[PDB]
Amino acid sequence: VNRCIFASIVYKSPCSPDAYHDDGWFICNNHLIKRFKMSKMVLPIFDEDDNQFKMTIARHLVGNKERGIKRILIPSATNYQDVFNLNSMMQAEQLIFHLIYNNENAVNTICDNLKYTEGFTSNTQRVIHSVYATTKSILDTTNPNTFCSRVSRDELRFFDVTNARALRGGAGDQLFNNYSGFLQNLIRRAVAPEYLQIDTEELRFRNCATCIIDETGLVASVPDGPELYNPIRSSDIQPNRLQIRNVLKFEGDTRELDRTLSGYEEYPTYVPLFLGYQIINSENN
Amino acid sequence: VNRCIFASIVPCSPDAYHDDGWFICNNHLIKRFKMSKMVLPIFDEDDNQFKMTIARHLVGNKERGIKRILIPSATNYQDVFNLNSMMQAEQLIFHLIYNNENAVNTICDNLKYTEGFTSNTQRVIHSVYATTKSILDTTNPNTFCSRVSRDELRFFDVTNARALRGGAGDQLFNNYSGFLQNLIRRAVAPEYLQIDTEELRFRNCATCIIDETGLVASVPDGPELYNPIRLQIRNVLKFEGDTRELDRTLSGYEEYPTYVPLFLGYQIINSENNFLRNDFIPRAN
Amino acid sequence: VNRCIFASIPCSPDAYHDDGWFICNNHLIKRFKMSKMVLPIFDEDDNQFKMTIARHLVGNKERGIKRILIPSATNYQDVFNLNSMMQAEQLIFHLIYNNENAVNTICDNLKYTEGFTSNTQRVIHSVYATTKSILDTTNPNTFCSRVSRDELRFFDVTNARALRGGAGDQLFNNYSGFLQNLIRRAVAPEYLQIDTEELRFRNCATCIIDETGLVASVPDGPELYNPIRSSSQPNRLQIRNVLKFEGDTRELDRTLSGYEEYPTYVPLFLGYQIINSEN
């Protein structure tokens, strides 16, 4: 039932129960925290008030104080190994990552290593092969670059729209493609465009984008100036050597005054992901 | 207790009864200015909290010009306010607000010309008048001994705050009646806040632009964002709610608000904090 | 009997307890960031006894003027928004600093009020008269006994062998005897010349005195860490910068509890002192 690759892995995998349901997302929200700093979300859209589309969206908890690498949400096939250091991680995780990045050479090296171990042949071979095949089969349950484009559509999505005060830049759609198509689907669920064309009409959803794609990887960054403050809830996640941090935090009184005011309309303040443009065909000409 | 200015009417929401500086029902707020009494929760995620007002615009997307105007400039009041439709009390209120002494005295003589004034309704009417008067009087920051902002100053552009530049919008704000200034400063959340030692950016991009024509909802650039809500045409568009159910997973997903709240102007705090926050003094710069 | 001066007008319990200190610990903490305490002493043996020493409480990250514990009579008018607190405290401050001009100014400002010609005048006379009475009980006039007296004894270690001291050592003699005494009561002389031998009790003085007043400055290097602990304004808020650590040895701490604890503080030491024959 549980789709999650981590739920396939064998420790604990206390997946968020959603993964047992129709949505079919590749990852439990828990592991979404684990490596991605992001929460799946919805942004319902409607005109006749039938709430029709309920389109998915994602929010990130990237700390404002993060710099450099930590700004990167998802590293490129270049240097993801350096970003992650999978030796901090189990062999199953290493396998999965190498598969996703198509590091088939490393996959070969791991299978060579395990070959000569008796615990491989005696016990683990069924686990390794079942996980390998199952994972790849899941990927190829979509892989719309392959498989007749059975899943989704051409979809007419673009992420590449000009920043008008930028130069005529734009690159690494090649890299987008090179991402295993489950990644591309994930993005197509994470990031809404600022714009959509209806078959006869265009609609705009935010004043400005919120995220960018470097050749290095997806980066939550302002196009200019300081990053916005992110109040990371800190409700959710080792320091075997002791770990320390400074932090800047509130102090002050008077909060009681809100007792009455709390009745008013209240605004959620998370950081959504915006980038790109969409259209629906009037006809599949 | 009910302190909506439109209690004077000779109907307000119960929410008006809170002792709060709105001095208006959400009812009349909507019915005149297409806005809602909203608030911002702000957190430092120890569950240390801070809070501010919000009011999303409600005016429909398509309509233009005066339709984009939320409240006209005094020089342009009647262009929006079709006074002839609007009851003399309403007219007098507005004229006072805009300082239209001329119209005030005009209505004064109209009292006599309304030979029904012989009915001694004048007593009630003028009582209502003075009632109204009271509130403006209280709002008047110019009263010598009234308390004023000194830890704080609000501005209506980034540059205007950052260098006290001759922001024409800020100039015209000052020129407006003190009540209007008060209501604006009450309603409008900034894009940025400087702090006694720090600065915070809430969004990379402002909501709207305003100019000497009046209070204006216009976007800074491009098209207005989507804004949802007998011999006539309902003209409704409709779209394929095919019932492709997904709630079985999505129901837990957090839903981003579909609203256009205010991120307009720039606040400075630049002093040893002595907020004294629990008082609605005019608190002028 | 309440000993604290401020109790005239929330005092710590030691105010009403038999403190030899002038001031309640609450007021001391608020104003000058210090805590009242002691050190024991031994006649080479279990035959042991005490001497008072305070420790200051100022943070590691305080800088410039903030480094001052007790400013001089000049700079204190800048260090403290004297307007920030009730007129009576202003008058008390001016009296203790001998700012009698400002005292008279406050008196005139009060008399200007039309409500002064009432029981307000009685209250004011009573309060400041009692304050002055205590002050003059502390201020030398024919003072000769052990109690509440000192007599030409030096902290300048180098000239104290000559029974002399530098102008900086003289400095506090410029202040009221109240100040001079309570200073020396709080801060231990690090060298001592007992009537029989001279000894040292610490090698590295923890605090310094300047014309600006009492500076809780390190003589050298970076300032030492301080945990600000315990101890208000509905009006006020701000942001705090908080260091913290993780990786707790919680179950090893059980074993760590098994041996003597040495707490850490900044006890106040400087200079030198001569001691009289005692009985």
Add this chain to the structure above:
Amino acid sequence: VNRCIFASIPCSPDAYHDDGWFICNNHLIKRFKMSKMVLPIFDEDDNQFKMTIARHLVGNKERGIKRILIPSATNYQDVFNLNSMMQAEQLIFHLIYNNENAVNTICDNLKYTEGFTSNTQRVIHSVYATTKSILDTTNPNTFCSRVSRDELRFFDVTNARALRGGAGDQLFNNYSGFLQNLIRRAVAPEYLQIDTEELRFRNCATCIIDETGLVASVPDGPELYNPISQPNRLQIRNVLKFEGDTRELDRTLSGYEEYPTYVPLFLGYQIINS
């Protein structure tokens, strides 16, 4: 249950439990006139954290040899009469100080008198083997097989700023790894760069380590107030010159806090980055 070295054939309650001190505090005083202690410190964010430290009680003593806290391998056999101990414990000290020539000299007298039934050979050799095993548990490099892989520490602060502690640190490295370990227990650094955070903890170091041994104090002039052949029979008697109160006037101050009354060992420089 848990044991110190001196469980080797008395033991102390201090040695019912250990964290790599592996001596009674009894023996700490008995040998080097010091007591072990903990140094709790905190941030008020419920952020308590503790360090190990020791204190000596040998202030106001004179001419060095009286209050040297630790000998040197060059001189320990001189400053301590080896005849003070029996049952070849001299060999244990020779191991600790790396005088394996003296170890062999003792073994020359342990093979002599075979002790067929009592197996005095074994009687010494079991202790010696456990000593060597513990010493290489405190191996001078603590190679990763040796749990308790130490973090960096420096003592010559001035080159610890260059991470190049000089002759003092070289001599420390030459000293037996157990000595190094126990120094890590006893001596708090004057400075720690905890993720570059160069904290300072005291006005000044107290003790100083010479190539000849640990000296309780750098200065010998400004000595600090310090409370506390025919052996087993000596007596000393004291005289004091200070008429005063009958130790009751101080009862006024019975309520207030008192500052600690010790001279802990503060010395050196440390870095702990990532």
